[PDB]
Design a protein around this nucleic acid. Structure first.
Ligand SMILES: [Mg+2]
Ligand SMILES: [Mg+2]
Ligand SMILES: [Mg+2]
Ligand SMILES: [Mg+2]
Ligand SMILES: [Mg+2]
Ligand SMILES: [Mg+2]
Ligand SMILES: [Mg+2]
Ligand SMILES: [Mg+2]
Ligand SMILES: [Mg+2]
Ligand SMILES: [Mg+2]
Ligand SMILES: [Mg+2]
Ligand SMILES: [Mg+2]
Ligand SMILES: [Mg+2]
Ligand SMILES: [Mg+2]
Ligand SMILES: [Mg+2]
Ligand SMILES: [Mg+2]
Ligand SMILES: [Mg+2]
Ligand SMILES: [Mg+2]
Ligand SMILES: [Mg+2]
Ligand SMILES: [Mg+2]
Ligand SMILES: [Mg+2]
Ligand SMILES: [Mg+2]
Ligand SMILES: [Mg+2]
Ligand SMILES: [Mg+2]
Ligand SMILES: [Mg+2]
Ligand SMILES: [Mg+2]
Ligand SMILES: [Mg+2]
Ligand SMILES: [Mg+2]
Ligand SMILES: [Mg+2]
Ligand SMILES: [Mg+2]
Ligand SMILES: [Mg+2]
Ligand SMILES: [Mg+2]
Ligand SMILES: [Mg+2]
Ligand SMILES: [Mg+2]
Ligand SMILES: [Mg+2]
Ligand SMILES: [Mg+2]
Ligand SMILES: [Mg+2]
Ligand SMILES: [Mg+2]
Ligand SMILES: [Mg+2]
Ligand SMILES: [Mg+2]
Ligand SMILES: [Mg+2]
Ligand SMILES: [Mg+2]
Ligand SMILES: [Mg+2]
Ligand SMILES: [Mg+2]
Ligand SMILES: [Mg+2]
Ligand SMILES: [Mg+2]
Ligand SMILES: [Mg+2]
Ligand SMILES: [Mg+2]
Ligand SMILES: [Mg+2]
Ligand SMILES: [Mg+2]
Ligand SMILES: [Mg+2]
Ligand SMILES: [Mg+2]
Ligand SMILES: [Mg+2]
Ligand SMILES: [Mg+2]
Ligand SMILES: [Mg+2]
Ligand SMILES: [Mg+2]
Ligand SMILES: [Mg+2]
Ligand SMILES: [Mg+2]
Ligand SMILES: [Mg+2]
Ligand SMILES: [Mg+2]
Ligand SMILES: [Mg+2]
Ligand SMILES: [Mg+2]
Ligand SMILES: [Mg+2]
Ligand SMILES: [Mg+2]
Ligand SMILES: [Mg+2]
Ligand SMILES: [Mg+2]
Ligand SMILES: [Mg+2]
Ligand SMILES: [Mg+2]
Ligand SMILES: [Mg+2]
Ligand SMILES: [Mg+2]
Ligand SMILES: [Mg+2]
Ligand SMILES: [Mg+2]
Ligand SMILES: [Mg+2]
Ligand SMILES: [Mg+2]
Ligand SMILES: [Mg+2]
Ligand SMILES: [Mg+2]
Ligand SMILES: [Mg+2]
Ligand SMILES: [Mg+2]
Ligand SMILES: [Mg+2]
Ligand SMILES: [Mg+2]
Ligand SMILES: [Mg+2]
Ligand SMILES: [Mg+2]
Ligand SMILES: [Mg+2]
Ligand SMILES: [Mg+2]
Ligand SMILES: [Mg+2]
Ligand SMILES: [Mg+2]
Ligand SMILES: [Mg+2]
Ligand SMILES: [Mg+2]
Ligand SMILES: [Mg+2]
Ligand SMILES: [Mg+2]
Ligand SMILES: [Mg+2]
Ligand SMILES: [Mg+2]
Ligand SMILES: [Mg+2]
Ligand SMILES: [Mg+2]
Ligand SMILES: [Mg+2]
Ligand SMILES: [Mg+2]
Ligand SMILES: [Mg+2]
Ligand SMILES: [Mg+2]
Ligand SMILES: [Mg+2]
Ligand SMILES: [Mg+2]
Ligand SMILES: [Mg+2]
Ligand SMILES: [Mg+2]
Ligand SMILES: [Mg+2]
Ligand SMILES: [Mg+2]
Ligand SMILES: [Mg+2]
Ligand SMILES: [Mg+2]
Ligand SMILES: [Mg+2]
Ligand SMILES: [Mg+2]
Ligand SMILES: [Mg+2]
Ligand SMILES: [Mg+2]
Ligand SMILES: [Mg+2]
Ligand SMILES: [Mg+2]
Ligand SMILES: [Mg+2]
Ligand SMILES: [Mg+2]
Ligand SMILES: [Mg+2]
Ligand SMILES: [Mg+2]
Ligand SMILES: [Mg+2]
Ligand SMILES: [Mg+2]
Ligand SMILES: [Mg+2]
Ligand SMILES: [Mg+2]
Ligand SMILES: [Mg+2]
Ligand SMILES: [Mg+2]
Ligand SMILES: [Mg+2]
Ligand SMILES: [Mg+2]
Ligand SMILES: [Mg+2]
Ligand SMILES: [Mg+2]
Ligand SMILES: [Mg+2]
Ligand SMILES: [Mg+2]
Ligand SMILES: [Mg+2]
Ligand SMILES: [Mg+2]
Ligand SMILES: [Mg+2]
Ligand SMILES: [Mg+2]
Ligand SMILES: [Mg+2]
Ligand SMILES: [Mg+2]
Ligand SMILES: [Mg+2]
Ligand SMILES: [Mg+2]
Ligand SMILES: [Mg+2]
Ligand SMILES: [Mg+2]
Ligand SMILES: [Mg+2]
Ligand SMILES: [Mg+2]
Ligand SMILES: [Mg+2]
Ligand SMILES: [Mg+2]
Ligand SMILES: [Mg+2]
Ligand SMILES: [Mg+2]
Ligand SMILES: [Mg+2]
Ligand SMILES: [Mg+2]
Ligand SMILES: [Mg+2]
Ligand SMILES: [Mg+2]
Ligand SMILES: [Mg+2]
Ligand SMILES: [Mg+2]
Ligand SMILES: [Mg+2]
Ligand SMILES: [Mg+2]
Ligand SMILES: [Mg+2]
Ligand SMILES: [Mg+2]
Ligand SMILES: [Mg+2]
Ligand SMILES: [Mg+2]
Ligand SMILES: [Mg+2]
Ligand SMILES: [Mg+2]
Ligand SMILES: [Mg+2]
Ligand SMILES: [Mg+2]
Ligand SMILES: [Mg+2]
Ligand SMILES: [Mg+2]
Ligand SMILES: [Mg+2]
Ligand SMILES: [Mg+2]
Ligand SMILES: [Mg+2]
Ligand SMILES: [Mg+2]
Ligand SMILES: [Mg+2]
Ligand SMILES: [Mg+2]
Ligand SMILES: [Mg+2]
Ligand SMILES: [Mg+2]
Ligand SMILES: [Mg+2]
Ligand SMILES: [Mg+2]
Ligand SMILES: [Mg+2]
Ligand SMILES: [Mg+2]
Ligand SMILES: [Mg+2]
Ligand SMILES: [Mg+2]
Ligand SMILES: [Mg+2]
Ligand SMILES: [Mg+2]
Ligand SMILES: [Mg+2]
Ligand SMILES: [Mg+2]
Ligand SMILES: [Mg+2]
Ligand SMILES: [Mg+2]
Ligand SMILES: [Mg+2]
Ligand SMILES: [Mg+2]
Ligand SMILES: [Mg+2]
Ligand SMILES: [Mg+2]
Ligand SMILES: [Mg+2]
Ligand SMILES: [Mg+2]
Ligand SMILES: [Mg+2]
Ligand SMILES: [Mg+2]
Ligand SMILES: [Mg+2]
Ligand SMILES: [Mg+2]
Ligand SMILES: [Mg+2]
Ligand SMILES: [Mg+2]
Ligand SMILES: [Mg+2]
Ligand SMILES: [Mg+2]
Ligand SMILES: [Mg+2]
Ligand SMILES: [Mg+2]
Ligand SMILES: [Mg+2]
Ligand SMILES: [Mg+2]
Ligand SMILES: [Mg+2]
Ligand SMILES: [Mg+2]
Ligand SMILES: [Mg+2]
Ligand SMILES: [Mg+2]
Ligand SMILES: [Mg+2]
Ligand SMILES: [Mg+2]
Ligand SMILES: [Mg+2]
Ligand SMILES: [Mg+2]
Ligand SMILES: [Mg+2]
Ligand SMILES: [Mg+2]
Ligand SMILES: [Mg+2]
Ligand SMILES: [Mg+2]
Ligand SMILES: [Mg+2]
Ligand SMILES: [Mg+2]
Ligand SMILES: [Mg+2]
Ligand SMILES: [Mg+2]
Ligand SMILES: [Mg+2]
Ligand SMILES: [Mg+2]
Ligand SMILES: [Mg+2]
Ligand SMILES: [Mg+2]
Ligand SMILES: [Mg+2]
Ligand SMILES: [Mg+2]
Ligand SMILES: [Mg+2]
Ligand SMILES: [Mg+2]
Ligand SMILES: [Mg+2]
Ligand SMILES: [Mg+2]
Ligand SMILES: [Mg+2]
Ligand SMILES: [Mg+2]
Ligand SMILES: [Mg+2]
Ligand SMILES: [Mg+2]
Ligand SMILES: [Mg+2]
Ligand SMILES: [Mg+2]
Ligand SMILES: [Mg+2]
Ligand SMILES: [Mg+2]
Ligand SMILES: [Mg+2]
Ligand SMILES: [Mg+2]
Ligand SMILES: [Mg+2]
Ligand SMILES: [Mg+2]
Ligand SMILES: [Mg+2]
Ligand SMILES: [Mg+2]
Ligand SMILES: [Mg+2]
Ligand SMILES: [Mg+2]
Ligand SMILES: [Mg+2]
Ligand SMILES: [Mg+2]
Lengths: 146, 97
RNA sequence: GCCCGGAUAGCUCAGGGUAGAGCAGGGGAUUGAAAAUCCCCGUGUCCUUGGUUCGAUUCCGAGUCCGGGCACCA
RNA sequence: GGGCCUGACUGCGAGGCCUGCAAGCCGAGCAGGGGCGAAAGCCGGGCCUAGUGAACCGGUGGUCCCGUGUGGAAGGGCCAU
RNA sequence: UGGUGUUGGCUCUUGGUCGCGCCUGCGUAGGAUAGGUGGGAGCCUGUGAACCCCCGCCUCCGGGUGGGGGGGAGGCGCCGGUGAAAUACCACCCUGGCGCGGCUGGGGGCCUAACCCUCGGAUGGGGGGACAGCGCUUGGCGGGCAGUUUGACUGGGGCGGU
RNA sequence: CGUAGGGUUAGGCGGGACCUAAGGUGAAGCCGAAAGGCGUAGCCGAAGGGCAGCCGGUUAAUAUUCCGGCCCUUCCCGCAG
RNA sequence: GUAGGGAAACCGAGUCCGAACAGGGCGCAGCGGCCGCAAAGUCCGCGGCCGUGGACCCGAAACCGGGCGAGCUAGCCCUGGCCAGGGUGAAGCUGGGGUGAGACCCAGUGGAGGCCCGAACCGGUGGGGGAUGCAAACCCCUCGGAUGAGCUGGGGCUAGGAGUGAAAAGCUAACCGAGCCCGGAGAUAGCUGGUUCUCCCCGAAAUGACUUUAGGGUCAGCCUCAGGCG
RNA sequence: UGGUUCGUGGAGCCAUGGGGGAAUCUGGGCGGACCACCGCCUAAGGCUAAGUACUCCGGGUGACCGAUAGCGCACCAGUAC
RNA sequence: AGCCGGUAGCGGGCGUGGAUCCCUGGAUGUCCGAAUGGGGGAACCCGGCCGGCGGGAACGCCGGUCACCGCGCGCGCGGGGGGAACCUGGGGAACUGAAACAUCUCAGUACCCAGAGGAGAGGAAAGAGAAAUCGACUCCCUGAGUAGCGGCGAGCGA
């Protein structure tokens, strides 16, 4: 009796998988405990629907990512600070690079998704990895200046 | 045993035919009937307890049509059944037949 | 009528290259006998018949004979 | 008693005996292929009268007659047992 | 009372078939533990050889072999001696033994959720538990019950006889 | 016996508007081809529980029933505590 | 009906068995002078007899279905009621004796018991009577039980292959080895009985064979009618 | 196992109590085991007059009865008993 | 043109201003009965609610309403019971016949039960069955005592 697992189960399968079990195991255990639902034609389609939407709403987040990748790697964010030869008096932070990115180029960004351990204290050119989406990193060249 | 609530399978009358001798197709003289008496064949009726709409419903059903019960449960989700007695829930399932 | 056993010494039983074993039988040791015991000895187409092998009790085919087993009977 | 042999035939059968029926009995002669005999001829078991069992059901060997739209098959029939 | 349905999870141990893999096979004559035929003058070894240490082993107790730590130019064949049957390496197969794998099947152990019992409380707890009960089917016991049969001749019937 | 007329009077007697017994019936629930069979509560069910009337007089015919004397019960409403 | 033979394929005045042109089985063909009469056959009516039906009529003991019954009787359930009077005198208790303490003994009190006697009540032992009865079980005399496994009123439950039974196959509405009513139903009866106006002609058999047959049947024998032969 | 003429028969077909369990026309059932070929038909949802049966009722008519007959009942009969 | 039932009589009435009487529709219709507010030993007994009658609160009477079940959304609609035969479905004997009896027969009859209606069933091919054909079903004739079925018996029978 084929059923659709609603949870991952020990040596049966992964959630969403369609496995074949003895009718009794399904009626008297799996189905009443919500661990699975019998693989009817009626909800076979329901599985095909949510796989089709999930991978859709996944790849759209990939395209929302590639949109900010094509843009942000294709420019430099320039930060005027006050400094003496090398050392900045204050510091530029993610919050700083944030408010900077909109005011200059009209794009919003998330400080927390940006890779900066210690706040930037030296003048120069930096490359800062950005992740609005795993496996889709955005390199950002940033120029801090006087 | 009585009647399947799903299929309407029902006890039937059959004969119990006692035979002796060797079948002709085995080189025998032939079968002789040494007794015919009436008897009944009952449906393989069983109990099926399912939880529907938060109520417990029991079916007396032939084993053959046991899956037909769980299907009625699936066909039932589109119905508005809460507040109902188990008796009234069962009635709704059986009209989905 | 079909399946499954057999046949090996006097009696009963063991088994691709042996023909065995026990008990019956005979002498010998031994004894109040009657035994128990102990030593030695015999008793084979391994049913027949046909072929396999290099040869065969075996393997096979075939009948003969006795067994067991199941079914049937107008 | 011995020699050669298988007629302890196949296909029929005039005419009778007996007889409630059904059975039972005897049978010359013709054809096929034989045996014995020089031949005439004899041989369809046994000097004779007991040694037996209708039909139904079914087995087996033939026959190739029927074969459920058709060709086959299934299963029957027929001859023999 | 077998099969099967209702009837499920996890283990353990067996049996049988099929496929592959590897080995086993000792009367004698003889190099020794020679399966059957067949191919065959060459196979192997640096893609590790003659002994050594570990053991799966099976031994008919002489031996056979398997994996492993030894181990750094070598072992057996055709040669041939007696063989019915030659010894190397391959190859289909026979008698077995296992190692997996396929499908079957038998036991045992546990589990809980079907089903059963129970708990003043119950979508729950406890116990039994895939047994039991019940359906279909198998064969058996079965005067408890049922339908019947249980001859005729005959110096009456029975008995005897036929 | 035939025809006709007359005769049986209750808050307190008996039964019901009270209670339950066996049993019967039976919302729940269970079972059975049909008919039906069960079944907790509940309901029904008495000669058992419970409950307020004694004596006399009267009629052709009834009387703890009518009458007389002396008693009592329940229900409704009211007043008081 | 007009064609039959063969198990059949099939042939056909023939066909089957067979190797046969053999042999056999079962089959095949009007009176008058083209008119006429007759006829195969077939159709209707009438009569005899047969088959199927209850089949000439009456009659079982029984079998089956569905119902009706425990107001009789049997057991049980619930709830009530009844058992004059007299007799016997268990245990226990008290006192006394007893002994180390006891057992135990005596007296008194006590009132037990499927105890005794005997009415009611329940029975039914022997005899007599009755015998178209007073009575489809009674009457008289006698006799058993009578505090118990007792008797009895009312209310209930259990039934037909079923109940109930201190057990007799007893009882279940006056006949119970399987109740009663209606139904299957006109069961079946190879048995017994019965079978109705007249006259005329003929006129048997009681044997044989076979028969779960023997007092019943089939065939033959023997009777009768019609047509034919002579 | 039932139905049909079909009693296990060569036993199909229709139905179905139990087990196993498809497909959507290039799908499926049938033509008497089975197979090939050739044909027939579209299962697992339902409805549908009329032609047919019967006679409590009414009328019409009898080579139907005529009071022991005809209905059990001609009548105060499903009565009396 | 007579009339007040069978039914006369006593005693009283009606009708050509159309009676009695016949047909149709309507009104009334105690109580019981499917019986249905509840109970019950049918034709009796005891209640709730609203309204009315009495002097009426107790008591009583009158009118309306109040069972259970099914189905649709407390309101509705329907069901229940009967009917001589006839009909369909679910169950289903035995005597008897086989001159015994068991398979077979009687017979899917008798009977029980559910349901139905003036009928009921059946009915528009997953048919038939050999016709290269037919064309729903029902009913009658015939096919035919054929084909077949059968302790190949008795019989059964498309
Ligand atoms: Mg800052
Ligand atoms: Mg059976
Ligand atoms: Mg054969
Ligand atoms: Mg038979
Ligand atoms: Mg038979
Ligand atoms: Mg029968
Ligand atoms: Mg039975
Ligand atoms: Mg279950
Ligand atoms: Mg559940
Ligand atoms: Mg099924
Ligand atoms: Mg199934
Ligand atoms: Mg043989
Ligand atoms: Mg022996
Ligand atoms: Mg011997
Ligand atoms: Mg000689
Ligand atoms: Mg001679
Ligand atoms: Mg010669
Ligand atoms: Mg002759
Ligand atoms: Mg003769
Ligand atoms: Mg003779
Ligand atoms: Mg002769
Ligand atoms: Mg000659
Ligand atoms: Mg010559
Ligand atoms: Mg000559
Ligand atoms: Mg001759
Ligand atoms: Mg014979
Ligand atoms: Mg016979
Ligand atoms: Mg035959
Ligand atoms: Mg043959
Ligand atoms: Mg042919
Ligand atoms: Mg065919
Ligand atoms: Mg054919
Ligand atoms: Mg062909
Ligand atoms: Mg042909
Ligand atoms: Mg043949
Ligand atoms: Mg044959
Ligand atoms: Mg043949
Ligand atoms: Mg013959
Ligand atoms: Mg069983
Ligand atoms: Mg199982
Ligand atoms: Mg366990
Ligand atoms: Mg355990
Ligand atoms: Mg636990
Ligand atoms: Mg549990
Ligand atoms: Mg649990
Ligand atoms: Mg529980
Ligand atoms: Mg539990
Ligand atoms: Mg547990
Ligand atoms: Mg089980
Ligand atoms: Mg089986
Ligand atoms: Mg059995
Ligand atoms: Mg008996
Ligand atoms: Mg017996
Ligand atoms: Mg028994
Ligand atoms: Mg006999
Ligand atoms: Mg006799
Ligand atoms: Mg005699
Ligand atoms: Mg005598
Ligand atoms: Mg005599
Ligand atoms: Mg005499
Ligand atoms: Mg005499
Ligand atoms: Mg005798
Ligand atoms: Mg008087
Ligand atoms: Mg009076
Ligand atoms: Mg008074
Ligand atoms: Mg009142
Ligand atoms: Mg009362
Ligand atoms: Mg009460
Ligand atoms: Mg109810
Ligand atoms: Mg009822
Ligand atoms: Mg009822
Ligand atoms: Mg009841
Ligand atoms: Mg009760
Ligand atoms: Mg009350
Ligand atoms: Mg009552
Ligand atoms: Mg009462
Ligand atoms: Mg009282
Ligand atoms: Mg009391
Ligand atoms: Mg009282
Ligand atoms: Mg009183
Ligand atoms: Mg007083
Ligand atoms: Mg007085
Ligand atoms: Mg008086
Ligand atoms: Mg007074
Ligand atoms: Mg006050
Ligand atoms: Mg013919
Ligand atoms: Mg010929
Ligand atoms: Mg000729
Ligand atoms: Mg001829
Ligand atoms: Mg006559
Ligand atoms: Mg005649
Ligand atoms: Mg009759
Ligand atoms: Mg008749
Ligand atoms: Mg007659
Ligand atoms: Mg009988
Ligand atoms: Mg009998
Ligand atoms: Mg009865
Ligand atoms: Mg009584
Ligand atoms: Mg009484
Ligand atoms: Mg008392
Ligand atoms: Mg007394
Ligand atoms: Mg006294
Ligand atoms: Mg006394
Ligand atoms: Mg005295
Ligand atoms: Mg006394
Ligand atoms: Mg005295
Ligand atoms: Mg005294
Ligand atoms: Mg005392
Ligand atoms: Mg003392
Ligand atoms: Mg004393
Ligand atoms: Mg006393
Ligand atoms: Mg005294
Ligand atoms: Mg006494
Ligand atoms: Mg005395
Ligand atoms: Mg006395
Ligand atoms: Mg008495
Ligand atoms: Mg007496
Ligand atoms: Mg006396
Ligand atoms: Mg007397
Ligand atoms: Mg007398
Ligand atoms: Mg008398
Ligand atoms: Mg007396
Ligand atoms: Mg007296
Ligand atoms: Mg006296
Ligand atoms: Mg006395
Ligand atoms: Mg006395
Ligand atoms: Mg006494
Ligand atoms: Mg006494
Ligand atoms: Mg007394
Ligand atoms: Mg007592
Ligand atoms: Mg009493
Ligand atoms: Mg009493
Ligand atoms: Mg009584
Ligand atoms: Mg009882
Ligand atoms: Mg009873
Ligand atoms: Mg009764
Ligand atoms: Mg009876
Ligand atoms: Mg009866
Ligand atoms: Mg008996
Ligand atoms: Mg009994
Ligand atoms: Mg008694
Ligand atoms: Mg009676
Ligand atoms: Mg009586
Ligand atoms: Mg009696
Ligand atoms: Mg008697
Ligand atoms: Mg008696
Ligand atoms: Mg009887
Ligand atoms: Mg009887
Ligand atoms: Mg009797
Ligand atoms: Mg009686
Ligand atoms: Mg009677
Ligand atoms: Mg009746
Ligand atoms: Mg009747
Ligand atoms: Mg009859
Ligand atoms: Mg009669
Ligand atoms: Mg008889
Ligand atoms: Mg007779
Ligand atoms: Mg008579
Ligand atoms: Mg006479
Ligand atoms: Mg004459
Ligand atoms: Mg004369
Ligand atoms: Mg004679
Ligand atoms: Mg005679
Ligand atoms: Mg005989
Ligand atoms: Mg006899
Ligand atoms: Mg005799
Ligand atoms: Mg006799
Ligand atoms: Mg006789
Ligand atoms: Mg005669
Ligand atoms: Mg004569
Ligand atoms: Mg004559
Ligand atoms: Mg005549
Ligand atoms: Mg004449
Ligand atoms: Mg049939
Ligand atoms: Mg059949
Ligand atoms: Mg049949
Ligand atoms: Mg068939
Ligand atoms: Mg077919
Ligand atoms: Mg089929
Ligand atoms: Mg089928
Ligand atoms: Mg099925
Ligand atoms: Mg197609
Ligand atoms: Mg297809
Ligand atoms: Mg089909
Ligand atoms: Mg067809
Ligand atoms: Mg078709
Ligand atoms: Mg269609
Ligand atoms: Mg259809
Ligand atoms: Mg219709
Ligand atoms: Mg019609
Ligand atoms: Mg009429
Ligand atoms: Mg009339
Ligand atoms: Mg008269
Ligand atoms: Mg009359
Ligand atoms: Mg007269
Ligand atoms: Mg008359
Ligand atoms: Mg009438
Ligand atoms: Mg009348
Ligand atoms: Mg009469
Ligand atoms: Mg009369
Ligand atoms: Mg009368
Ligand atoms: Mg007047
Ligand atoms: Mg006057
Ligand atoms: Mg007058
Ligand atoms: Mg005028
Ligand atoms: Mg007018
Ligand atoms: Mg009117
Ligand atoms: Mg009422
Ligand atoms: Mg009532
Ligand atoms: Mg009021
Ligand atoms: Mg007043
Ligand atoms: Mg008032
Ligand atoms: Mg009132
Ligand atoms: Mg009033
Ligand atoms: Mg009212
Ligand atoms: Mg009714
Ligand atoms: Mg109706
Ligand atoms: Mg009918
Ligand atoms: Mg029917
Ligand atoms: Mg019927
Ligand atoms: Mg029966
Ligand atoms: Mg019978
Ligand atoms: Mg009989
Ligand atoms: Mg008959
Ligand atoms: Mg008979
Ligand atoms: Mg007879
Ligand atoms: Mg008999
Ligand atoms: Mg019979
Ligand atoms: Mg039968
Ligand atoms: Mg009959
Ligand atoms: Mg029948
Ligand atoms: Mg009838
Ligand atoms: Mg009509
Ligand atoms: Mg119609
Ligand atoms: Mg259509
Ligand atoms: Mg048709
Ligand atoms: Mg066409
Ligand atoms: Mg068409
Ligand atoms: Mg014809
Ligand atoms: Mg028949
Ligand atoms: Mg038939
Ligand atoms: Mg038949
Ligand atoms: Mg029949
Ligand atoms: Mg038919």
């Amino acid at each position: 009796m084929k059923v659709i697992l609603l949870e991952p189960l020990e040596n049966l399968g992964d959630v969403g998988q369609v496995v074949d079990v003895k009718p009794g195991y399904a009626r008297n255990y799996l189905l009443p405990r919500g661990l699975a639902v019998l693989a009817t034609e009626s909800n076979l389609k329901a599985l095909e629907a949510r796989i089709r939407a999930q991978a859709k709403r996944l790849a759209e987040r990939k395209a929302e990512a590639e949109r900010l990748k094509e843009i942000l790697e294709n420019l430099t964010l320039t930060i005027p600070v006050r400094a003496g030869e090398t050392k900045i008096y204050g510091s530029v932070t993610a919050k700083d690079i944030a408010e900077a990115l909109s005011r200059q180029h009209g794009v919003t960004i998330d400080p927390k998704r940006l890779a900066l351990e210690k706040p930037i204290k030296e003048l120069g050119e930096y490359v800062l990895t950005y992740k609005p989406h795993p496996e889709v990193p955005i390199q950002l060249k940033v120029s801090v200046v006087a | 045993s009585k009647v399947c609530e799903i299929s309407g399978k029902r006890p039937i009358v059959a004969n119990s035919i006692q035979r002796r001798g060797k079948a002709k197709r085995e080189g025998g003289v032939g079968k002789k009937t040494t007794g015919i008496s009436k008897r009944r064949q009952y449906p393989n009726l069983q109990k099926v307890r399912v939880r529907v709409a938060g109520q417990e419903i029991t079916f007396r059903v032939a084993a053959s049509h046991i899956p037909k019960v769980y299907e009625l449960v699936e066909r039932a989700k589109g119905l508005k059944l809460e507040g109902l007695s188990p008796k009234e829930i069962k009635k709704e399932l059986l009209k989905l037949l």
